Amino acid sequence: GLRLPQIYAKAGISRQKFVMKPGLSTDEKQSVISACYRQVFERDISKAYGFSFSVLESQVKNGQISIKEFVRSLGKSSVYQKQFYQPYVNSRVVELAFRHFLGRNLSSLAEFQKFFAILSKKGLTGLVDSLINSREYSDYFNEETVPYIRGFGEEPQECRNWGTQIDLFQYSAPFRKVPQSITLFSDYLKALPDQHPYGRGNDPLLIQFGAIFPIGTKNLKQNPAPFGKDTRRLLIRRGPGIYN
Amino acid sequence: MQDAITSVINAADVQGKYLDANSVEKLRGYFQTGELRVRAAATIAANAATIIKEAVAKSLLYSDITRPGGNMYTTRRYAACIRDLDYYLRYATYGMLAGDPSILDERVLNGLKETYNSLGVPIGATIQAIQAMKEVTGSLVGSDAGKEMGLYFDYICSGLS
Amino acid sequence: MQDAITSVINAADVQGKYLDANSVEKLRGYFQTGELRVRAAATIAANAATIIKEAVAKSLLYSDITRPGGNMYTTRRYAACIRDLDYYLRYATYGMLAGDPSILDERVLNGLKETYNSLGVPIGATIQAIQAMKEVTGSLVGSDAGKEMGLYFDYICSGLS
Amino acid sequence: MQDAITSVINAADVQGKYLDANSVEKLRGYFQTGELRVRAAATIAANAATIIKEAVAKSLLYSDITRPGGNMYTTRRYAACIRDLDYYLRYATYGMLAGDPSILDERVLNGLKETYNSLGVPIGATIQAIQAMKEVTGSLVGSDAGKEMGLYFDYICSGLS
Amino acid sequence: MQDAITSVINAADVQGKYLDANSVEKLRGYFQTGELRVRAAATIAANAATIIKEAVAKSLLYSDITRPGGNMYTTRRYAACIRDLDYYLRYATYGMLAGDPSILDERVLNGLKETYNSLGVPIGATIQAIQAMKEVTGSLVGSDAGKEMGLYFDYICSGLS
Amino acid sequence: MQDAITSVINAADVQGKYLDANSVEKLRGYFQTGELRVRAAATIAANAATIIKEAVAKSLLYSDITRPGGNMYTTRRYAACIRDLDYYLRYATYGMLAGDPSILDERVLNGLKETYNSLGVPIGATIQAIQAMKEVTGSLVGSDAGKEMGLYFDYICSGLS
Amino acid sequence: MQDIITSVINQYDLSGRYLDIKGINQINNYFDTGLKRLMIAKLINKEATNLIKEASELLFIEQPELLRPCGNAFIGNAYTTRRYAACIRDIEYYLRYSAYSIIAGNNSILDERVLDGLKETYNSLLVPIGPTIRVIQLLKEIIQKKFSTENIENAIIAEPFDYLAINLSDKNL
Amino acid sequence: SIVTKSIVNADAEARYLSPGELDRIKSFVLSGQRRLRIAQTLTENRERIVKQGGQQLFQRRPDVVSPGGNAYGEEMTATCLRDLDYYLRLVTYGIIAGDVTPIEEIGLVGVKEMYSALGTPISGVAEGIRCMKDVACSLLSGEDAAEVGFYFDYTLAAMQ
Amino acid sequence: SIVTKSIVNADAEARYLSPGELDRIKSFVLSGQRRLRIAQTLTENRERIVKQGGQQLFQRRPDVVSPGGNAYGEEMTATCLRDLDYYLRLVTYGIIAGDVTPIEEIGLVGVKEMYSALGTPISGVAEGIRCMKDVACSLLSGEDAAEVGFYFDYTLAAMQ
Amino acid sequence: VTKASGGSPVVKPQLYKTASMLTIAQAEQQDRFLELGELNQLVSFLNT
Lengths: 244, 161, 161, 161, 161, 161, 173, 160, 160, 48
Ligand SMILES: CCC1=C(C)/C(=C/C2=NC(=C\c3[nH]c(/C=C4\NC(=O)[C@H](C)[C@H]4CC)c(C)c3CCC(=O)O)/C(CCC(=O)O)=C2C)NC1=O
Ligand SMILES: CCC1=C(C)/C(=C/C2=NC(=C\c3[nH]c(/C=C4\NC(=O)[C@H](C)[C@H]4CC)c(C)c3CCC(=O)O)/C(CCC(=O)O)=C2C)NC1=O
Ligand SMILES: CCC1=C(C)/C(=C/C2=NC(=C\c3[nH]c(/C=C4\NC(=O)[C@H](C)[C@H]4CC)c(C)c3CCC(=O)O)/C(CCC(=O)O)=C2C)NC1=O
Ligand SMILES: CCC1=C(C)/C(=C/C2=NC(=C\c3[nH]c(/C=C4\NC(=O)[C@H](C)[C@H]4CC)c(C)c3CCC(=O)O)/C(CCC(=O)O)=C2C)NC1=O
Ligand SMILES: CCC1=C(C)/C(=C/C2=NC(=C\c3[nH]c(/C=C4\NC(=O)[C@H](C)[C@H]4CC)c(C)c3CCC(=O)O)/C(CCC(=O)O)=C2C)NC1=O
Ligand SMILES: CCC1=C(C)/C(=C/C2=NC(=C\c3[nH]c(/C=C4\NC(=O)[C@H](C)[C@H]4CC)c(C)c3CCC(=O)O)/C(CCC(=O)O)=C2C)NC1=O
Ligand SMILES: CCC1=C(C)/C(=C/C2=NC(=C\c3[nH]c(/C=C4\NC(=O)[C@H](C)[C@H]4CC)c(C)c3CCC(=O)O)/C(CCC(=O)O)=C2C)NC1=O
Ligand SMILES: CCC1=C(C)/C(=C/C2=NC(=C\c3[nH]c(/C=C4\NC(=O)[C@H](C)[C@H]4CC)c(C)c3CCC(=O)O)/C(CCC(=O)O)=C2C)NC1=O
Ligand SMILES: CCC1=C(C)/C(=C/C2=NC(=C\c3[nH]c(/C=C4\NC(=O)[C@H](C)[C@H]4CC)c(C)c3CCC(=O)O)/C(CCC(=O)O)=C2C)NC1=O
Ligand SMILES: CCC1=C(C)/C(=C/C2=NC(=C\c3[nH]c(/C=C4\NC(=O)[C@H](C)[C@H]4CC)c(C)c3CCC(=O)O)/C(CCC(=O)O)=C2C)NC1=O
What we know:
The structure is cut from a larger assembly and holds 2 copies of chain A, 5 copies of chain B, 1 copy of chain G and 2 copies of chain H.
Chain A: H1 6-10, H2 26-41, H3 45-49, H4 54-62, H5 67-75, H6 78-84, H7 90-102, H8 109-132, H9 135-140, H10 162-168, H11 182-187
Chain G: H1 4-14, H2 21-46, H3 48-62, H4 81-104, H5 108-115, H6 118-125, H7 130-144, H8 151-168
Chain H: H1 2-12, H2 19-44, H3 46-60, H4 74-97, H5 101-105, H6 111-118, H7 122-137, H8 142-158
The complex binds phycocyanobilin (CYC) (10 copies).
GO biological process, one term (chains H, I): photosynthesis
GO cellular component, one term (chains H, I): chloroplast thylakoid membrane
Membrane topology (chains H, I): Peripheral membrane protein
């Protein structure tokens, strides 16, 4: 648990919320539904590609389903699983789902273990159901508010998923194809890895004729680690161990 | 994001100073051009679709990138790229109104080259499409507003290259 | 993911070509083996638990990795690793039905070595367990389907090493 | 590395084209500003040490980062950071002479953020020191050359952020 | 590497503080046990080969790992593992003399689990051999020095697990 | 929500009519009182906390509802009710600026009686607190703005009863 | 996190053996200081506000530049009321978590819930790390002035703050 | 309406209207009089505007009234002029509201679906609106015509 | 551990430990001595406990050691006694920790998956644990046996 | 000793609001492209 002085968040440009009372104008209903699209799909796919959810939009405008049910059936649609389930591994799917339905990053290793086991056993609908049915969702969004991003100036942050979360709240997030939080929370509990003292991208491929550095602008598989000034890499002798 | 006023106030506040004559100079400079900026922003909001259409037609509409094998061959890719151009135009308009390109750094250029490199989007063609959009936009808004808008267009192109 | 048909159609479409004789050759090749593929997939779905049990029993059941200090010592770790083996078998079956290992690249191998290295999971023992699973699976499905399945098993092992 | 001429020749050669009127436009543009570029590069080579000294004095010389606990507290760290600033100035001069920031991508920005993150070097203070160096450099070389140099200074700051 | 004195001085210097009463407390604590530490280090240097021989004899000498199929079956592997045990004993002695396990982090544990996993060396057997070496070493040096040495032995075992 | 202008435009548009003399009459009526409305809204935004404090002090501060057994006994309930009064004041100000109580119907009164009945909140005491707030608000903003604000205060009280 | 009992039990589970007299002596060591650890926890809960007020005052008296304008270097210090409130909030954080650590007899709660990621956050916000440790050991001295002659409580208090100071530090030597 | 939109945008953030929004409401209520005058002029010259716009459309797009075109025949031409009158009325509404909310909520949301279901080419409607824009701006002053065409341009952009 | 669990449950709420949690930690550290004594007694009588529990299990469940049963043969019976020793060790850990966190984190999470993958009937393991519980409680006093069986009962409930 | 790092990106906290900037952010969050209404929500602040 954290704590924050109330004026520390009252400063600045004020992220805004979208509510879906039936009886609003049509203007507000359209703006609310489009904000929902931007939240769940990271951008308005209705305007860019002409995707549409006719039954869902009419049902949510009339008030037969709430914004929670609308987001729940958006998360288990075919569009969502084509864009954010199929091109990823399950560990990355969990991390992206937490951004899309809770507006935040993974906090703990045990949290990842729990939700990865759920996705493991029950698929995407099971994962989405366990996310939207949680107490935290209702604590932040009770049936009518569109989920928003809980950035830095909005809520007291914890210094444990700081950089990982700030990178999750970027449009470059869907192109980090390697999971970012399971590896980080695993490496907190282990010794330093076997890599160059600088970033992981400073190690070349040991091939016949090389100069190949695969990590870089095109890969985005990058892992800095704190290496002290005094430190010696464990090298493996090309030959018997004992001539090391 | 910080506009010209925010930047001046920050430069003065980071030294414990009151706003002296140079700050007044910059503030007057922004206040004199604000009305031209509002006029240009309105005109650009009026004709965004036609600007993007004409820039695409003059820059990459009949080249080989739109044919099979090209980046933007299928309909998905064509729509995605015109959406990208709309993003660039809207954010350049924001930067022109603010008189400060920090919004471009925070909301546009941060991690854009890496995304384009992972996707395989050609950077040179993108920069050329932005340059063509700069022509049409300066054309439509006149000389002074066109130079103002071209400042941020060139800022985006330099951040992308 | 793309299967054999999707890959052929993509190779033809990326050149603006109609499906010529070589595409017909590959398509007939896939259509002739589809029924054997369905038979093998059904048989593998029938006996997944026994396949995993026998592979674990022949590969790492009595070694030192299951004793105190070993990776899969506690019950959590044992359950996690048998779940991993179930993943590998199911995705190899998907790849065999599709006739294309792209699903393995997109859904399995992407960032797997890095996860195992961060967790401390031994890669050699995993590759050996997958090799033992390949034996039992080829055993159960017969020679042709076993070679088909072993293709994707070896694909996973090469992507993991 | 590729300069403006190399980039134009590459854009023309990658299409099997001869250098047409637009290539001539860009080539004339570079040839007209080359002499100003040489003047600025000479002046910057003349006063590199004083530029770095003044930028450090105005940006981080008396802040808390130079006190115990800061990043550049000991003499090793102070010397290392002034060497880093010398690197940035020299490579910005190379980029200004070439008229193309590709040398900055190949020789400076590649893996720099990761090195600084592993070492614990504060990125914001570095960007602010580069911004202060941009002020002094534009000051010393005049308006046009200062805008040219500030292009590549901002390129480095964007690649670092 | 940093010993107890270096760690105290660093904790005091990272706050701009002079060495106050708590630093004096820790420094006196180290200075009182230094002579016992020197005695233990001398005795361990005297009997390193016999310690390793007895630990190997009690831990893994007649188990199945030394038979065909075991890791240390051939003579190369036997020699390599006894060299590893010598490394562990020498570095534990360094850590005991220094009163600080940072040398173990910098020179031993950094990338050791990954090397052992790539080679296929069983981690549990290694931890058990280190535990057996802890018994013999505490035996030879007496209770207080044995607890001191066992601190760093357990540190190595925890970093390896 | 719809203000006076939106309501007039809707009444004209729902008949396929152009804005005739009666619409002009209503529009002029709103435009003449807009400046008084802005003045009142500013003054009310200035003194919201004091208005709520004085209304609570004159209406229910020393009654039996604040004692043990009363609705708002504990600190949770006191804070909740003062938050409710803040809601009522803010939405009455919105309605006064808009010149139309439809926002009160859409955002306040919809399902409020049912919520209060399920919670057990006394409706009569709430209506009396709103009436006391009407006194203080009309007091602070003068006669005309007080009648305007009292219109929407009475609207809320009628929708609640 | 892990208290001392959990970590000893985990060390013994790693080799798969029952608890012998050595680990049992280690557990007895904690069981014999538990009550005075609880006394220290209650003292900290009784004097938290005053202790942090004293620590902040003593920090700002000797580091007066922390209250002045940032200097152009956009450093996050206690310049304005916003930054000032944030810094006092952090001081309360440190006090709370080292009280937890004193009760647990272990420092694992510290490096799991405080230290992991701390320097990244402070570097991105440009928060001073020197004065930050300075205030931590100021708090340590202020607490130790309540139990002075009872040396065992002195070391029990010294443990968490000194762990935090040595881990937030850089290794010049 | 500008007041309505300011109120909703302030309502989502759970705050009162800042002094900028109040400034803009003030400027709007101060200009309401010339807004009503411009709406007057456009409103009561509707017959000439619709007629001359219909001419420019039919000369620019002879196919729509050619034999078989969507607006072919007396009744279909009358219906098309009816549509142009609809859009002129909506433009007057938008001029008095100070914002395109009336135009967009009535006549722009779902216009492509409607005109596709009717078989009408949307580009012809855009041409008619442009012709009406020129005809209507011909009757205004410089600044008035600039402000009035501001809404015709939005209606054209939405109707692409 | 009780201290650990109190600390996490207080940490989630972002508050210090209330006086109730501190009271309970105090009571725990005060009882730690008899906890260590009970762990002593259970620890160093492990051979008789495992042996007599294995007997009661094999007499209650002759199928598991019948020809072909999961624990059929010398090696399989030895492995089953090994498992019973594992669980007795975990029970001693839980007794000294004051809570079933050691037992549950090691040996209970995912136990059904493991024993299903091995082909072992979980009810046989539950029977063995119950037999060991009776044998071990026979060697303790009244209150000590009550407190010690408190953990065997949890292990049985988790192993249904 | 901390053994892993998630990186430290460049962060700029919000200090205060601005009438010249309270408007671009509203249209920017919604992609609203600066309506004619708040397009007027810059002029007179620049006219004062
Ligand atoms: C779909 C592709 C895919 C795979 C394969 C995958 C693996 C994966 N394996 C994991 C753990 C694990 N994996 C193993 C596996 C093994 N141990 C051994 O000794 C054997 C060699 C090996 C089994 C053959 C173990 C023991 C863990 C637990 C690590 C721990 O608890 O610390 C975890 C951590 C999640 C958790 O359990 O909480 C993931 C995400 N994720 C994926 O998305
Ligand atoms: C200073 C810290 C440090 C350590 C510890 C270290 C270990 C290390 N151990 C190695 C091999 C080895 N290590 C062992 C060890 C063992 N086999 C067993 O069964 C036992 C459990 C264990 C001994 C207790 C064996 C058998 C090899 C040879 C592997 C092979 O030849 O394939 C190698 C490969 C180099 C070579 O021999 O060519 C390295 C680099 N390097 C370091 O820098
Ligand atoms: C594989 C899916 C796919 C499609 C369909 C596609 C269409 C496409 N149609 C184009 C142009 C065009 N398309 C037309 C078509 C028509 N004019 C009419 O009146 C008719 C209604 C219609 C013919 C039936 C015209 C006239 C142009 C040129 C427009 C211009 O340059 O002004 C262009 C720009 C130039 C080019 O052809 O490269 C593209 C990319 N691209 C794709 O990747
Ligand atoms: C606000 C700043 C910002 C930008 C600019 C941005 C771009 C961005 N462009 C994308 C794709 C794309 N972008 C393009 C663009 C182009 N193709 C060309 O040939 C042209 C040179 C160029 C247009 C001028 C194309 C074709 C794709 C689709 C890639 C694909 O489907 O594989 C994607 C992948 C998301 C998706 O479409 O599913 C992102 C995130 N994101 C941002 O947050
Ligand atoms: C712990 C090892 C260590 C040292 C030694 C150190 C020195 C150091 N000396 C400095 C300045 C300075 N040092 C001097 C010193 C001198 N002027 C003279 O004529 C004399 C020869 C000499 C005094 C004996 C002066 C005048 C400045 C200010 C220079 C300026 O700002 O122009 C500065 C820049 C401002 C500051 O003090 O923060 C540093 C970092 N830093 C370190 O970490
Ligand atoms: C159980 C939680 C709880 C509290 C605390 C509570 C307080 C409470 N305090 C009141 C008055 C009051 N209480 C105070 C108290 C004080 N002035 C001082 O200087 C001192 C610091 C303090 C006395 C220690 C004052 C001054 C008033 C009257 C102020 C006024 O007349 O407005 C009243 C109105 C009494 C009535 O309606 O019959 C209530 C209900 N109610 C609750 O349910
Ligand atoms: C429980 C472990 C933990 C810690 C410690 C923590 C710290 C933390 N300190 C922060 C800010 C801050 N911290 C300070 C602190 C200081 N200024 C100084 O000059 C002094 C050196 C120091 C006071 C002693 C300041 C000024 C800020 C605000 C920075 C800014 O906004 O400019 C913030 C950003 C605001 C927030 O989201 O809460 C975090 C997350 N978070 C955690 O989860
Ligand atoms: C620009 C908006 C702004 C203000 C005003 C501000 C004030 C501020 N006043 C402070 C202290 C102080 N301020 C004062 C005194 C006073 N203060 C007054 O406004 C009176 C003139 C006077 C009382 C008569 C004293 C005596 C202290 C020392 C704090 C203490 O020890 O209690 C402190 C704590 C650090 C320091 O000692 O400098 C801040 C941050 N911060 C802000 O961001
Ligand atoms: C207030 C917003 C609004 C609009 C715009 C609207 C349009 C609308 N246009 C219609 C028909 C029509 N509209 C046209 C229009 C045209 N033909 C052409 O070639 C030209 C491109 C165009 C004239 C510029 C025609 C020909 C019909 C009759 C189609 C038919 O009956 O087959 C109809 C069906 C009959 C009717 O008028 O009731 C509706 C409802 N309704 C609305 O509520
Ligand atoms: C600390 C928590 C923990 C447990 C409990 C554990 C159990 C465990 N039980 C095993 C086997 C076994 N366990 C049994 C047990 C039984 N057969 C019966 O009929 C009875 C119902 C039952 C005895 C009460 C048998 C027969 C095997 C060997 C199965 C085989 O190899 O086919 C194995 C594989 C071989 C080995 O012992 O290394 C593991 C890992 N591991 C753990 O880490």
